[PDB]
Amino acid sequence: DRIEKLIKKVSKPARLSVERCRLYTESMKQTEGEPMIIRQAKALKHVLENIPIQILDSELIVGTMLPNPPGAIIFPEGVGLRIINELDSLPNRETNRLMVDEEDAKVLREEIAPYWQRKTIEAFAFPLMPDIMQILYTGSVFVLTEIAGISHVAVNYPYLLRRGFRWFLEESERRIRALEESGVYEGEKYSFYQAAKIVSEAVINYGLRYSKLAEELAESEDGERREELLKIAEICRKVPAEKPETFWEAVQFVWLVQSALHQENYEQAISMGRIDQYLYPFFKKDIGEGRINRELAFDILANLWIKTNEIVPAFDSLLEQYFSGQATNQAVTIGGCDIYGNDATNELTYLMLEVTDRLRLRQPNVHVRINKGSPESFLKRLAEAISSGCNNLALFFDDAAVKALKNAEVDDRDALNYTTDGCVEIAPFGNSFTSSDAALINVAKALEYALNEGVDLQFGYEFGAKTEKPKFLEDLLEKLREQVSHIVKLVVRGSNVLSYANAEVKPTPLLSLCVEDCFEKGVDVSRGGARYNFTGIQAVGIADVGDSLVAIEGALNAGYSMDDIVEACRKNFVGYEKLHKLLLQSPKYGNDDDAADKYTKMVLEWYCEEVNRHRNFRGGKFAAGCYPMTTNVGFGFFTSALPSGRKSGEPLNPGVSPSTGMDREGVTAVINSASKLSYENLPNGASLTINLSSDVLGEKGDAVIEALIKSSMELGVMHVQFNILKEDLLRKAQQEPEKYRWLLVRVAGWSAYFVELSRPVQEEVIRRISCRI
Amino acid sequence: DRIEKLIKKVSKPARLSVERCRLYTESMKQTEGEPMIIRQAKALKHVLENIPIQILDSELIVGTMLPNPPGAIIFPEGVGLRIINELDSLPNRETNRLMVDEEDAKVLREEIAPYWQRKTIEAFAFPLMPDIMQILYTGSVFVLTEIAGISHVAVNYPYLLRRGFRWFLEESERRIRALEESGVYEGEKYSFYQAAKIVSEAVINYGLRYSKLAEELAESEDGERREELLKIAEICRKVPAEKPETFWEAVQFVWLVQSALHQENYEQAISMGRIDQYLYPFFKKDIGEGRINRELAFDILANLWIKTNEIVPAFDSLLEQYFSGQATNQAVTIGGCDIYGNDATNELTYLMLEVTDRLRLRQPNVHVRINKGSPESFLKRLAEAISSGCNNLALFFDDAAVKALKNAEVDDRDALNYTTDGCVEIAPFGNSFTSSDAALINVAKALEYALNEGVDLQFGYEFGAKTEKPKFLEDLLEKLREQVSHIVKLVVRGSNVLSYANAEVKPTPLLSLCVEDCFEKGVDVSRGGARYNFTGIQAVGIADVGDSLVAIEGALNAGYSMDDIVEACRKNFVGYEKLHKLLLQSPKYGNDDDAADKYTKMVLEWYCEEVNRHRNFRGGKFAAGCYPMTTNVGFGFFTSALPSGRKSGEPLNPGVSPSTGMDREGVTAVINSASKLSYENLPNGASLTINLSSDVLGEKGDAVIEALIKSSMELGVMHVQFNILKEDLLRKAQQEPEKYRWLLVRVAGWSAYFVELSRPVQEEVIRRISCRI
């Protein structure tokens, strides 16, 4: 069958791809001194008209993301110069290896890198935040990702599918004329429609190139395959330019613009939204008009899922520690309700679960919305996939998610119709720009500053508020809240400068067509044309500070003073080995223990209310999230010992999941603990990962996992994801990695091949495998 | 069974009700000199706390619209003083008779009428448009209904059902405090929340009064009925104040606020929206939790449908000619698609069709959205009801309707999720104020002015543009377009003055809570707080001017001159009997004849583009509609003879339906003609009525009506409605009216009891019964 041929032709080693990077620069040199949005349009056009294209083995959906797939696309306007600086290490390094063709390694080092030097987003922002860039680079307090660009949005495909790109081209033309009739006093709006025109033409022509290759391959081909390539030629002539009428035409539409978007916007989290909802009209018409059958429809969706595995991120050695596991994350959202609360599961929802279950690949990040009205069969079928170790699903609970959005002042209907993107981030579908991973914040560092008068405990960094030495518990709490505030303020200032920087040196016109209000208002997405505008920033280490507070509570209570506890931390418990054992013995978040997990909850609420009050550059507000990527590990390295008994250098806790090995009452008790957090104030999402041994599942694999699903729904958690892991298979995968490179895990919000995770991160997924409950 | 007991207790003669009118005045006297929005709040409160209430025979849903039902509610702030001026004629007049208690007839004539004299909406607007009021009252050119108030909106029940009125009360209280903290510089916003508070309290207390009556009746009652009244007591204690959790709780919620709204806002078109979509979560939960069964659910909906028959309009003798047939029109919208295009028919859609089919009462105005993806069973089931003479359905075609809304600049999703209200008017659901019957315009009068240099042909009224005497056909067309323009401008000026007048003397705070953005922005609905703001104005006589143009074309062509044709018209074809026969013989709109129906289409497009360009007071734009009420008759009386051969005084054509007896090629050919009109420019709706003889249906009643349904969908019409009429039953209903007062007809967008239509209107429904196709 067809899937088998497709699966094997994305299992070959990945390369550092260069053709987008080159042709971009080539256009940007031809365009210097022109209006920047037109330059971006013209660059995107040039790459789409000149990138090598190929249709692959037995494909029904075409559009390689880069020529000769598995690879990394380079964005030197953003953060692609990070990776040029380490070209030697790329083919031989332990995680996310990329072969580099040495002929184009020369093209990067002396053609690309000297041009883009000081033409980047970071070059704009630097003189405006030099003090923030300095503390960013210490790796210890936060990371700001908007250096690399924005992305992180589920693309409004239903907006696109109701118009097609020939509409945009013509409408841009009507609007260019009308602007000229009024004497072009609206220069910005004019530049926009000029860009839109160009960018529409590019996309139309890009479909046309694949139509021509399909025709060229079919006069050289036999039987059924010749029938297929002639269909592909016919489809790609029509769509991305016209409104599609068939399901195949719709799925080929979305994938062309999806691959196109990846030439303009950087690799992170460009998602497809509620794909089961909006492909269903074409699907329902085609079945029962006989046009297609169920197995062809399956193969079509399979092809799409498989194609999103063509990218792998261009992360350097440092970025591999904080984002380990080949994180790109073109997400897909299935299931959920309509704008009335009715169940919106259709037959295409089930289909999409099946193709996900069969494929078990690292990508797409499949996100399943469930609620109290989801069909019982669908929950069973979800539980079967998860229990049989598919390890590639995430569950999103509608109740908590729409409550979060309503507090972020989203409309009823826009909250009900939400989508997901990236790992765990939630957003109104199609009319929002949420910059959903704009920063990640080490809140453990806040506590560290809070007991050392705004100095780093082991590094001498004066980055914190100038608080005093703490005495009692109660005035460490005030000092903590003040420090969280201070650190949040640092990233809100930083991200805003960066958002202005993006608007100025990297507007993104194609993406703008795909995000509602932008095209109609004639303002680019990076300037704020989306209806809702948000900036998602994330708390990491919420349990580490929570637990350190419980452990301080009891240690003062019986015996010790504050000065002891900070000195213990500074000295890494060397010479403090009695107290340290009492700290470690103290109650932990993750065990349904109110006296422990009330502190973590309170820490999150403080964080949330300190975030949600600030406004961003794009004219909306900031949005609080709690998910780690692998920055809980990265920040950990440079986090000192904290009064929870965590040793200096050790990993922090991931998302809203408890610290490693502190979950002694088991997996149901973790969920009870996690569902105590105020999700209603967390509108950028939360990551809860539950790791289960396969033996503990046993014969009743189904029953016990559906139990956990219905339990997390009833107790009101926002997000849950599961891992079914066999420990010595994971041990054997360290030993012979290429033999076991099919081994899938959920890291902290996304699927990675276990082999591609670093040693600290691997050791963490192994140690978090739970047996109780 | 229960329905039978309920049906018979709204068949008694109607009264002129006075208790709302009185208690309103009573409060308004206590409140003089206070902020008008607070006065309106306090008045509404006073009536809801003091109106006599009663639970009726075997009711499950309670909330009489007026004490002792069938009746008219009087709004002296609007147009209720019209009817006091004719108190003597009310119990003994031929249509819409109202018994008047002579004790409260004295209260109207010397307590109500001298107070409200010059405190009305019209009193505000008069000095600002005295020239328009003068030409309004000649009845000949347009009617402006906003003298009477606004209404005409489908109420946002899902907004309400997700909050409940205790939320509003408390939120108003938080917002009143925060306004005070900032020193109340936002006085208007402050007045608003003050009103909202008051109006929420009123509604909570109003539910509580019905809870107490239910408790009082149940300590005096037996068995099953005592079980029911105790449930009603329990339900009305909880809801309108809390979010409902059961289906019965939901339906009782909506009806309480629905009856409440009718004490604040005048009788026209306060509708319930997509009721099948938003009651379905409660329904689906209750079935299969055993809470309710299918027959109880039926009875609950039956009770609601039956209760909307308690009102009958307070129209005087002149208003009865232009709005004959007891038009109030609490509409209900079932069927249609979601915001993705998927079919949104659920089991509750079918239920609602069934209760409609069984009841066959004049009210609710049931509106069925269908599209190309509607289930085949549902179309069959619609066709069965219609063919069996139910005569109480209207069909709305999604394709044409969402295209109309998108051109009015409605968002994709808001257009897909549209609702209907009144007769045929369409609107984004829940976040719009469209004033959907704000005016009706006699476009035949435009043509009359167009060939008499802006003078009325038989009345000497100089109300038209000062055009010249027409010579050729081509320069009568220019002169026509200019005259349509001139007349539209007159009503846009008039309606805007009136809309400002409403905002000033009749803000409507309860209704404001129910229309989205209003409460959140803290601005009343009449001031423009709704997300979309529109003003619906209607063309009447589009075929009369269309046909007069074809008839002018051929009459000039062969022989005659322009001066002849106008003189013929002025002289009512007396002395012009040859030419008149040629005019009558000329091609007519309604027969699929391009040479005829191209003129009508063009007339509508001119009208539409002249309307849709003007902006209203509430900060949106005007919206073009084409439906008559019975003003096609009323305007007819005072319309002179026109070159189509229509005699002076005769009725004009209704909606987008052809002139009476000009539809010689039959019913399919009428639909082809009607589907040539540009619906994409008609965003306030169109009325097409198809009248069929029951014999012509024959044994294949189903087949031939589904044929017409699928034909009107395929040919792209906006709205169609059907009548199955037996001619001599209608003849017998003139003879013995009270014996035949159950006889239902669709007038031009709504159901009336044939007995309640005037002689000119009755004669029209009889003569329009078609036999061909």
Coordinates of C-alpha atoms in Angstrom, one line a residue, chain A residues 192-454:
Chain A
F192 CA 0.7 46.7 1.9
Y193 CA -1.5 46.1 -1.1
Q194 CA 1.5 46.3 -3.3
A195 CA 3.0 43.6 -1.3
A196 CA -0.2 41.5 -1.2
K197 CA -0.4 41.7 -5.0
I198 CA 3.2 40.5 -5.5
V199 CA 2.8 37.8 -2.8
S200 CA -0.5 36.5 -4.3
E201 CA 1.1 36.3 -7.8
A202 CA 4.0 34.3 -6.3
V203 CA 1.7 31.7 -4.7
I204 CA -0.4 31.3 -7.9
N205 CA 2.8 30.8 -9.9
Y206 CA 4.1 28.4 -7.2
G207 CA 1.1 26.1 -7.6
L208 CA 1.6 26.4 -11.4
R209 CA 5.2 25.2 -11.2
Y210 CA 4.1 22.0 -9.4
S211 CA 1.4 21.6 -12.1
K212 CA 4.1 21.6 -14.8
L213 CA 6.3 19.2 -13.0
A214 CA 3.3 16.8 -12.6
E215 CA 2.6 17.0 -16.3
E216 CA 6.3 16.5 -17.1
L217 CA 6.4 13.3 -14.9
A218 CA 3.2 11.8 -16.4
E219 CA 4.4 11.6 -20.0
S220 CA 7.0 9.2 -18.6
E221 CA 4.9 7.0 -16.4
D222 CA 2.5 4.1 -16.3
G223 CA -1.1 3.3 -15.6
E224 CA -2.5 4.3 -12.2
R225 CA 0.5 6.5 -11.4
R226 CA 0.0 8.4 -14.7
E227 CA -3.7 8.9 -13.8
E228 CA -2.6 10.4 -10.4
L229 CA 0.0 12.8 -11.8
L230 CA -2.4 14.1 -14.4
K231 CA -4.9 14.8 -11.5
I232 CA -2.1 16.5 -9.6
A233 CA -1.4 18.7 -12.7
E234 CA -5.1 19.6 -12.9
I235 CA -5.4 20.3 -9.2
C236 CA -2.3 22.5 -8.9
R237 CA -3.3 24.5 -12.0
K238 CA -6.6 25.4 -10.2
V239 CA -5.7 25.6 -6.6
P240 CA -4.0 27.8 -4.6
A241 CA -5.6 30.3 -7.0
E242 CA -9.3 29.3 -7.1
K243 CA -11.7 28.2 -4.4
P244 CA -11.4 24.4 -4.3
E245 CA -14.5 22.2 -4.8
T246 CA -13.3 18.8 -4.0
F247 CA -11.6 17.4 -0.9
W248 CA -8.4 16.6 -2.8
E249 CA -8.5 20.1 -4.1
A250 CA -8.9 21.5 -0.6
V251 CA -6.1 19.4 0.9
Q252 CA -3.7 20.4 -1.9
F253 CA -4.7 24.0 -1.4
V254 CA -3.8 24.1 2.3
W255 CA -0.5 22.3 1.8
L256 CA 0.7 24.6 -0.9
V257 CA 0.2 27.7 1.2
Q258 CA 1.5 25.8 4.2
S259 CA 4.8 25.1 2.4
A260 CA 4.8 28.6 1.0
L261 CA 4.5 30.1 4.5
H262 CA 7.5 28.3 5.5
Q263 CA 9.6 30.2 3.0
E264 CA 8.6 33.5 4.5
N265 CA 8.2 32.7 8.2
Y266 CA 10.5 30.8 10.5
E267 CA 10.0 27.2 11.4
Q268 CA 8.0 27.4 14.6
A269 CA 4.4 26.5 15.0
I270 CA 2.8 27.6 11.8
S271 CA -0.3 25.5 12.3
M272 CA -3.4 24.4 10.3
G273 CA -6.1 25.0 12.9
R274 CA -9.4 23.2 13.1
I275 CA -8.7 21.1 10.0
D276 CA -11.4 18.6 10.7
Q277 CA -14.1 21.3 10.8
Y278 CA -13.2 23.0 7.6
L279 CA -12.3 20.1 5.4
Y280 CA -15.6 18.4 6.3
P281 CA -17.8 20.1 3.7
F282 CA -15.6 18.9 0.9
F283 CA -15.3 15.5 2.4
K284 CA -19.1 15.0 3.0
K285 CA -19.9 16.1 -0.5
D286 CA -17.3 13.8 -2.1
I287 CA -18.4 10.7 -0.2
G288 CA -22.0 10.0 -1.5
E289 CA -21.3 11.7 -4.7
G290 CA -18.9 8.8 -5.2
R291 CA -16.1 11.3 -6.1
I292 CA -13.8 9.7 -3.6
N293 CA -13.9 6.7 -1.2
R294 CA -12.8 6.4 2.4
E295 CA -9.4 4.8 1.7
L296 CA -8.4 7.5 -0.9
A297 CA -9.4 10.2 1.6
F298 CA -7.2 8.4 4.2
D299 CA -4.2 8.4 1.8
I300 CA -4.7 12.1 1.1
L301 CA -4.6 13.0 4.8
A302 CA -1.7 10.6 5.3
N303 CA 0.3 12.5 2.7
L304 CA -0.2 15.8 4.4
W305 CA 0.7 14.4 7.9
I306 CA 3.8 12.9 6.4
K307 CA 4.9 16.0 4.6
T308 CA 5.1 18.1 7.8
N309 CA 8.1 15.9 8.8
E310 CA 10.2 17.5 6.1
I311 CA 11.4 20.2 8.4
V312 CA 13.6 20.0 11.4
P313 CA 14.8 23.2 13.1
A314 CA 18.1 25.1 12.4
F315 CA 19.1 25.2 16.0
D316 CA 22.7 25.7 17.1
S317 CA 24.4 23.9 20.1
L318 CA 22.9 26.3 22.7
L319 CA 19.5 26.4 21.2
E320 CA 19.5 22.5 21.2
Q321 CA 19.7 22.5 25.0
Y322 CA 16.7 24.8 25.5
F323 CA 14.6 23.3 22.6
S324 CA 15.8 19.7 22.3
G325 CA 13.8 17.2 20.3
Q326 CA 13.6 18.8 16.9
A327 CA 10.8 21.2 17.7
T328 CA 9.0 22.8 14.8
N329 CA 5.4 21.9 15.5
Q330 CA 3.0 22.5 12.7
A331 CA 0.0 21.7 14.8
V332 CA -3.3 20.4 13.8
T333 CA -6.6 20.8 15.8
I334 CA -9.3 18.1 15.8
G335 CA -12.5 17.7 17.8
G336 CA -14.2 20.2 20.1
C337 CA -17.5 22.1 20.0
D338 CA -19.3 24.7 17.8
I339 CA -20.1 28.3 18.9
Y340 CA -23.2 27.0 20.6
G341 CA -21.7 24.2 22.7
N342 CA -22.9 21.4 20.5
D343 CA -20.4 18.6 19.8
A344 CA -18.5 19.3 16.5
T345 CA -17.0 15.8 16.1
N346 CA -17.6 14.6 12.5
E347 CA -16.4 11.5 10.6
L348 CA -13.3 13.4 9.5
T349 CA -12.3 13.8 13.2
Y350 CA -12.2 10.0 13.5
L351 CA -10.2 9.7 10.3
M352 CA -7.6 12.1 11.4
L353 CA -7.1 10.2 14.7
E354 CA -6.6 7.0 12.7
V355 CA -4.0 8.4 10.3
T356 CA -2.3 9.8 13.4
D357 CA -2.4 6.4 15.1
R358 CA -1.0 4.6 12.1
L359 CA 1.8 7.0 11.3
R360 CA 3.3 7.6 14.8
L361 CA 5.8 10.1 13.3
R362 CA 7.2 13.2 15.2
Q363 CA 5.0 15.5 13.2
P364 CA 2.2 17.0 12.9
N365 CA 1.6 18.0 16.5
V366 CA -1.9 16.6 16.8
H367 CA -4.2 18.4 19.3
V368 CA -7.5 16.9 20.3
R369 CA -10.2 19.1 21.8
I370 CA -12.5 17.2 24.1
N371 CA -15.3 18.3 26.4
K372 CA -18.2 17.0 28.5
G373 CA -20.3 16.4 25.3
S374 CA -17.7 14.5 23.3
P375 CA -19.1 11.1 21.9
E376 CA -18.3 8.1 24.1
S377 CA -16.9 6.2 21.1
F378 CA -14.5 8.9 20.4
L379 CA -13.1 8.9 23.9
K380 CA -12.7 5.1 23.8
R381 CA -10.9 5.4 20.5
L382 CA -8.6 8.1 21.9
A383 CA -7.9 5.9 24.9
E384 CA -7.0 2.9 22.6
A385 CA -4.5 4.9 20.6
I386 CA -2.8 6.4 23.7
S387 CA -2.7 3.1 25.7
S388 CA -1.2 1.3 22.7
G389 CA 1.8 3.7 23.0
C390 CA 1.1 6.1 20.1
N391 CA 2.6 8.9 22.1
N392 CA 1.7 11.6 19.7
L393 CA -1.6 13.1 21.0
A394 CA -2.4 16.0 23.2
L395 CA -5.7 16.5 25.0
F396 CA -7.3 19.9 25.4
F397 CA -10.2 20.5 27.7
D398 CA -12.8 23.0 26.3
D399 CA -14.2 24.1 29.6
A400 CA -10.9 25.4 31.0
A401 CA -9.7 26.7 27.7
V402 CA -12.7 28.9 26.8
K403 CA -12.8 30.2 30.4
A404 CA -9.1 31.3 29.9
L405 CA -10.0 33.0 26.7
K406 CA -13.0 34.8 28.0
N407 CA -10.8 36.3 30.7
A408 CA -8.4 37.5 28.1
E409 CA -11.6 39.3 26.8
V410 CA -12.3 37.0 23.9
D411 CA -15.9 36.9 22.6
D412 CA -18.1 34.0 23.4
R413 CA -18.1 32.6 19.9
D414 CA -14.4 33.3 19.2
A415 CA -13.5 31.4 22.5
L416 CA -15.8 28.4 21.7
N417 CA -14.3 28.2 18.2
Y418 CA -10.7 28.2 19.5
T419 CA -7.7 26.6 17.9
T420 CA -4.4 25.4 19.2
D421 CA -0.9 26.0 17.8
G422 CA 2.6 24.8 18.7
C423 CA 2.7 22.7 21.8
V424 CA -0.1 23.7 24.1
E425 CA -1.0 27.3 23.1
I426 CA -4.6 28.3 22.6
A427 CA -6.0 31.2 20.5
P428 CA -9.2 32.4 18.7
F429 CA -9.1 30.7 15.3
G430 CA -8.1 32.7 12.3
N431 CA -8.3 36.2 13.6
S432 CA -5.5 36.5 16.1
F433 CA -1.8 36.9 16.3
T434 CA -0.8 35.6 19.7
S435 CA 3.1 35.3 19.4
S436 CA 2.4 32.3 21.4
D437 CA 6.0 31.4 22.4
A438 CA 7.4 34.9 22.6
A439 CA 9.3 34.3 25.8
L440 CA 10.0 31.7 28.5
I441 CA 10.7 32.9 32.0
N442 CA 12.8 31.2 34.7
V443 CA 10.7 32.0 37.8
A444 CA 13.1 30.0 39.9
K445 CA 15.5 32.8 39.2
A446 CA 13.0 35.1 40.8
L447 CA 13.1 33.3 44.0
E448 CA 16.9 33.1 43.8
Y449 CA 16.9 37.0 43.5
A450 CA 14.3 37.1 46.2
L451 CA 16.6 35.7 48.8
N452 CA 19.9 37.2 47.7
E453 CA 18.8 40.9 47.4
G454 CA 18.5 40.8 43.6

